[PDB]
Design a protein around this ligand. Structure first.
Ligand code: WK6
Ligand code: WK6
Ligand code: WK6
Ligand code: WK6
Lengths: 223, 223
């Protein structure tokens, strides 16, 4: 069975786990603990980081011994899984649209990540201000792009829908009022979370015990 | 002829222009000025941002009316150009390696971008310390991955080589000590800069007048 490695949080790995839940692919989840404050001990990972044969040691990682693959980098992993499962564009037109949204979703995710793991209240507040001021426009742009479609390229779900749903879910949990100009994104959230494999994953004990972020974060550190 | 839009700096668009120089593709470079300090006026861009038909208005953009494409997001543009010019993987093994390095190059680039556009000398020094402390290990990981290869996937140059060269060049200019004695990566830098289309681009007046970063940056704002 393939092995997915990550912290016991949703974090960056969330879209990968949603894609795997949607497809029903069998895999082993290798979870690494973060110890309690103030040490936030991460020994189980630090002891393995350099002994897994990874070219770029990091979390998340995906190892399938049977297929001969070992991959790090969230985007490389999710694209690999997307190709394996057919959740990619069937035209260059579709691929351009998927890749533009992939990058827009990552841009929002990184901005949130930087905010969530801010060093102090000053920095957290500065980055929250930038989010509250710039994200409304970006959510309108995403809504316009989606239009009347079920998913990003139309009727067929692709890997980018999982990346967009994860960040939109985090934003709904961080500031719900951000969707007051794009109710279609609320329907998008309901559509994807209602898909059977995703609903089963989200209603599982394993998912419900996951904080969004690691214990040191200014937001999401506790379920 | 296709149009590539961006500020009059190397910045994020550098790998795209290196790829286009390598391929010899004819294109119009649409350059947007940044006015002098203190106003750093960008009105030529702000006036057009929303009138170009872009789904996610941003710089860089790539517009080819003849092919019917309009793209933003740097990674979406370079991947589109790579597929068009045959600079992508010829196997899933090659594709996984290219995508892992693509993500590693972007991670290094975003860390440098955050440092260069730091607001205060405290943030610049904090981010510089993280780079001086973490980048040596990452450069060794990249050198180990390259091994005795001319390029990331061997004798054949791919789009990721332009992305990696751009960030390594910036790092060479920022902190040579990371590269001054980094032997294999220096040879990699020299190999790519010796390609005829790259030589021609780097020795052109248009390139030589480009600062790395915009005028507000703590590093790179000057030729
Ligand atoms: N470039 C990589 C980069 C991989 C990377 O940065 N990994 C982090 C965990 S990742 C994390 S803590 N995410 C929390 C988070 C919260 C909210 C929104 C987004 C993300 C990590 O702990 N790595 C282990 C280590 O450094 O040894 C990728 O894209 O996967
Ligand atoms: N002005 C841009 C604001 C865009 C932006 O900065 N978003 C992310 C970085 S995400 C980024 S710049 N990725 C693009 C990229 C492409 C290729 C290589 C490296 C980086 C972010 O983290 N910013 C906020 C922060 O620093 O916390 C826009 O309007 O999209
Ligand atoms: N997600 C996008 C995000 C695109 C984006 O953030 N664009 C910036 C310029 S981008 C810039 S100034 N880069 C300098 C730089 C210097 C050194 C290293 C890396 C990058 C911008 O000003 N956009 C226009 C605007 O906000 O209206 C992408 O990936 O391309
Ligand atoms: N800590 C990890 C990683 C080092 C790191 O954080 N690098 C970049 C972000 S680049 C990043 S986390 N991209 C992964 C990613 C994947 C999918 C969605 C969103 C983001 C960066 O800008 N760091 C400095 C900063 O944000 O100030 C490692 O050591 O590998």
């Amino acid at each position: 069975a393939p092995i997915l490695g990550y912290w016991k949080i949703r974090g960056l790995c969330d879209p990968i786990r949603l894609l795997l839940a949607h497809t029903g692919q069998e895999y082993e989840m290798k979870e690494y603990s973060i110890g309690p404050e103030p040490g936030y001990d991460i020994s189980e990972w630090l002891d393995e980081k350099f002994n897994l044969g990874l070219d770029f040691p990091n979390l998340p990682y995906y190892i399938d011994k049977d297929e001969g693959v070992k991959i790090t980098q969230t985007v490389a992993i999710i694209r690999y899984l997307a190709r394996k499962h057919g959740l990619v564009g069937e035209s260059d037109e579709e691929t351009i649209k998927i890749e533009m949204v992939e990058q827009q979703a990552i841009e929002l995710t990184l901005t949130c990540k930087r905010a969530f793991y801010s060093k102090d209240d000053d920095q957290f507040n500065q980055l929250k201000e930038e989010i509250l001021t710039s994200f409304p426009r970006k959510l309108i742009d995403l809504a316009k792009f989606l239009g009347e479609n079920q998913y990003i390229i139309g009727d067929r779900i692709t890997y980018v829908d999982f990346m967009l749903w994860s960040i939109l879910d985090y934003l709904r949990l961080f500031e719900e009022s951000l969707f007051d100009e794009a109710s279609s994104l609320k329907d998008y959230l309901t559509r994807i979370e209602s898909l059977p494999g995703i609903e089963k994953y989200r209603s599982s004990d394993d998912f419900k015990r996951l904080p969004i972020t690691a214990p040191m974060a200014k937001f999401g550190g506790s379920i």
